[PDB]
Scaffold this active site. Structure first.
Site, PDB file in Angstrom:
ATOM      1  N   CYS A 139       3.586   1.564   9.386  1.00  0.00           N
ATOM      2  CA  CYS A 139       3.478   0.442   8.458  1.00  0.00           C
ATOM      3  C   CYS A 139       4.849   0.004   7.950  1.00  0.00           C
ATOM      4  CB  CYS A 139       2.514   0.750   7.318  1.00  0.00           C
ATOM      5  SG  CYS A 139       0.841   1.182   7.861  1.00  0.00           S
ATOM      6  N   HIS A 165       0.820  -1.214   0.000  1.00  0.00           N
ATOM      7  CA  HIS A 165       0.000   0.000   0.000  1.00  0.00           C
ATOM      8  C   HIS A 165       0.869   1.288   0.000  1.00  0.00           C
ATOM      9  CE1 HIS A 165      -0.210  -0.273   4.553  1.00  0.00           C
ATOM     10  NE2 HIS A 165       0.173   0.985   4.373  1.00  0.00           N
ATOM     11  N   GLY A 224       2.352   5.964   9.686  1.00  0.00           N
ATOM     12  CA  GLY A 224       3.779   5.953   9.384  1.00  0.00           C
ATOM     13  C   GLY A 224       4.492   4.714   9.920  1.00  0.00           C
TER      14      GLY A 224
HETATM   15  C1  LIG Z   1      -1.306   8.694   1.051  1.00  0.00           C
HETATM   16  C2  LIG Z   1      -1.828   7.275   1.100  1.00  0.00           C
HETATM   17  C3  LIG Z   1      -2.497   6.939   2.406  1.00  0.00           C
HETATM   18  O1  LIG Z   1      -3.195   7.747   3.014  1.00  0.00           O
HETATM   19  N1  LIG Z   1      -2.239   5.678   2.827  1.00  0.00           N
HETATM   20  C4  LIG Z   1      -2.695   5.007   3.990  1.00  0.00           C
HETATM   21  C5  LIG Z   1      -2.116   3.771   4.251  1.00  0.00           C
HETATM   22  C6  LIG Z   1      -2.623   2.955   5.243  1.00  0.00           C
HETATM   23  C7  LIG Z   1      -3.711   3.369   6.005  1.00  0.00           C
HETATM   24  N2  LIG Z   1      -4.367   2.450   6.882  1.00  0.00           N
HETATM   25  C8  LIG Z   1      -5.579   1.794   6.402  1.00  0.00           C
HETATM   26  C9  LIG Z   1      -5.336   0.970   5.164  1.00  0.00           C
HETATM   27  C10 LIG Z   1      -5.985   1.109   3.906  1.00  0.00           C
HETATM   28  C11 LIG Z   1      -5.432   0.328   2.920  1.00  0.00           C
HETATM   29  S1  LIG Z   1      -4.116  -0.588   3.548  1.00  0.00           S
HETATM   30  C12 LIG Z   1      -4.318   0.063   5.107  1.00  0.00           C
HETATM   31  C13 LIG Z   1      -3.899   2.108   8.119  1.00  0.00           C
HETATM   32  O2  LIG Z   1      -4.588   1.521   8.935  1.00  0.00           O
HETATM   33  C14 LIG Z   1      -2.447   2.477   8.435  1.00  0.00           C
HETATM   34  N3  LIG Z   1      -2.169   2.408   9.854  1.00  0.00           N
HETATM   35  N4  LIG Z   1      -1.540   1.326  10.381  1.00  0.00           N
HETATM   36  N5  LIG Z   1      -1.457   1.472  11.671  1.00  0.00           N
HETATM   37  C15 LIG Z   1      -2.034   2.677  12.005  1.00  0.00           C
HETATM   38  C16 LIG Z   1      -2.182   3.319  13.230  1.00  0.00           C
HETATM   39  C17 LIG Z   1      -2.764   4.581  13.252  1.00  0.00           C
HETATM   40  C18 LIG Z   1      -3.208   5.187  12.077  1.00  0.00           C
HETATM   41  C19 LIG Z   1      -3.079   4.545  10.851  1.00  0.00           C
HETATM   42  C20 LIG Z   1      -2.484   3.292  10.841  1.00  0.00           C
HETATM   43  C21 LIG Z   1      -4.243   4.641   5.798  1.00  0.00           C
HETATM   44  C22 LIG Z   1      -3.742   5.451   4.793  1.00  0.00           C
END
Ligand SMILES: CCC(=O)Nc1ccc(N(Cc2ccsc2)C(=O)Cn2nnc3ccccc32)cc1
Ligand SMILES: CCC(=O)Nc1ccc(N(Cc2ccsc2)C(=O)Cn2nnc3ccccc32)cc1
Lengths: 304, 304
Positions: free
Chosen positions: B145, B41, B143
């Site tokens: 991930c 992603h 951030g």
């Molecule tokens: C500019 C691109 C962008 O915004 N990308 C992005 C990537 C991952 C997430 N997601 C959800 C998701 C959607 C498809 S794959 C994962 C998370 O849960 C990422 N994440 N992981 N742990 C987290 C903890 C707090 C906030 C967000 C978090 C959100 C946004």
């Protein structure tokens, strides 16, 4: 989101751990620059541990009696000295893996990570707090002495603890990196009982703010209190008295959540008086006191 | 003595963390040999996250679009490919800090350490368990991930988890190092709810044995039970059914303490039916299930 008892990455400390052997006793040492720091009880036999005269014991020891091994290689000892309850072994080679570092003496209630070691090798890392009675509730077995406690500010390692002993109560006592014990403990196998272990009130409040930030809000109530009223309750429950300095350090957490410090104290007061009623906060059924306000801000912001 | 939620020393993993940027999205990567592994992603924008077609998105990407930075130095990308939900970026330099490593897919109930990272830099380490519903109760911010879960056997690092997402419930979902998600989760910003989170019975029993070894014995009772009787109680309290395989793995703990596995099950049964009555076990007011029997043996023996 989510809240965990997180320790600092231990890599910079792993590169400092060595094994120190004196006669038949092996413990851990901390190699920084050309000096190896270890507990002075490395020179003791089981008999001269009941009442050891370390100055007299160290007289019968020479540089060649201290075996320092870093991984699989032997370090050459060119000097030895005793500073309080630590031995400082001057070696002929500076540790190439020496990080930027400081020696600091922490205050009770402050937290730190411990890298538990055996034979100079790391076994694990966990987060601790220096209790108000100057003990740490660690996880140490025989051979763990010389394992260190530390905090990290970006690239600088602040060493704050060196493990020396386990009290008959199963709690742990040790020194700062100048060899001064935290608390009244002496490096002698004798009856040493810890004082009353009080709860670190400012840390419990910081953890309540972390719970709010992470979604756990059931404990928020419609009440407030005063520092004097709150402290009457804190005394009753062997909680540390809360001061204006504590309120001040909770300021950024209070600002983030919009919950006044005294309102959060009233939530804590009701939790102390009524208990959790079978409920949990951040996956815990008790009030957690081993996260400082700095720890909560750090974890809830992502400081690397 | 003492029992702590201990994580493996993170040093060997710290030396593998890099920062991966694709367009305006930055996350963590794992550099092992000449390959950098990261969540796929990383190629997504906020719009193509509701329903992303990763094969179509990756077509518009070239090796030069993936920026890989290791500390302060840029790695040159000579190949890119997608394996399930991970991207594998072939770089022209093998990581000199690559430890001995394996990629393993863990079973639910097994534990591992997580090195939380931001911008390729480590922020902290903590011990986790893969829940029976295939989620992890971690501590991750945006951030994080690409942060990895791992176990260590002396010098070999077994990578088992890569962080991909946080569910609306605040729990975390991710993949093994072949990019296969644990559980039914998809890397799509959509309604994905976790199944029932059951308690890992074998781990709670292992933790009761750890409590006995460390002095906490109040919960030991005069009773015994059978696997079928115990499991009737475990079902009622959403505990995982205990099997003979579980009894077998508790064998060394049973032998160390001299408390038969079924007797310990009867202690657990009474604790489930009556609660803790305001008491604690290993400093906890709830039954801890994130220590496997292997973890208890390791911590209570000192495996480095
Ligand atoms: C500019 C691109 C962008 O915004 N990308 C992005 C990537 C991952 C997430 N997601 C959800 C998701 C959607 C498809 S794959 C994962 C998370 O849960 C990422 N994440 N992981 N742990 C987290 C903890 C707090 C906030 C967000 C978090 C959100 C946004
Ligand atoms: C051969 C010489 C010898 O036997 N030395 C020795 C050293 C230290 C200890 N003590 C007590 C003490 C007496 C003087 S200074 C410290 C500990 O508590 C060591 N310790 N530290 N954490 C522990 C955890 C479990 C068991 C022992 C532990 C015991 C024995």
């Amino acid at each position: 989101s989510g809240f965990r008892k997180m320790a600092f990455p231990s890599g910079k400390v792993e590169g400092c751990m060595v094994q120190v052997t004196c006669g038949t006793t092996t413990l851990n040492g901390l190699w920084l620059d050309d000096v190896v720091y270890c507990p002075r009880h490395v020179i003791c036999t089981s008999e001269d541990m009941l009442n050891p005269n370390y100055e007299d014991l160290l007289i019968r020891k020479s540089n060649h009696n201290f075996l320092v091994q870093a991984g699989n290689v032997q370090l050459r000892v060119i000097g030895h000295s005793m500073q309080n309850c630590v031995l400082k072994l001057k070696v002929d080679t500076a540790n190439p893996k020496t990080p930027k570092y400081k020696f600091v003496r922490i205050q009770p209630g402050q937290t730190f990570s411990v890298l538990a070691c055996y034979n100079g090798s790391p076994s694990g890392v966990y987060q601790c707090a220096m209790r108000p009675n100057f003990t740490i509730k660690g996880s140490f077995l025989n051979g763990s002495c010389g394992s260190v406690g530390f905090n990290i500010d970006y690239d600088c390692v602040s060493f704050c603890y060196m493990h020396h002993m386990e009290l008959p109560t199963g709690v742990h006592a040790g020194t700062d990196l100048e060899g001064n014990f935290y608390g009244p403990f002496v490096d002698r196998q004798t009856a040493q009982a810890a004082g009353t272990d009080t709860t670190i009130t400012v840390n419990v409040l910081a953890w309540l703010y972390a719970a709010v930030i992470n979604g756990d809000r059931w404990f928020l109530n419609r009440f407030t209190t005063t520092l004097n009223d709150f402290n009457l309750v804190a005394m009753k429950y062997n909680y540390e008295p809360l001061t204006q300095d504590h309120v001040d350090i909770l300021g950024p957490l209070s600002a983030q959540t919009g919950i006044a410090v005294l309102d959060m104290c009233a939530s804590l007061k009701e939790l102390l008086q009524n208990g959790m009623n079978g409920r949990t906060i951040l996956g815990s059924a008790l009030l957690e006191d081993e996260f400082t306000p700095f720890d909560v801000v750090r974890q809830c912001s992502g400081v690397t």
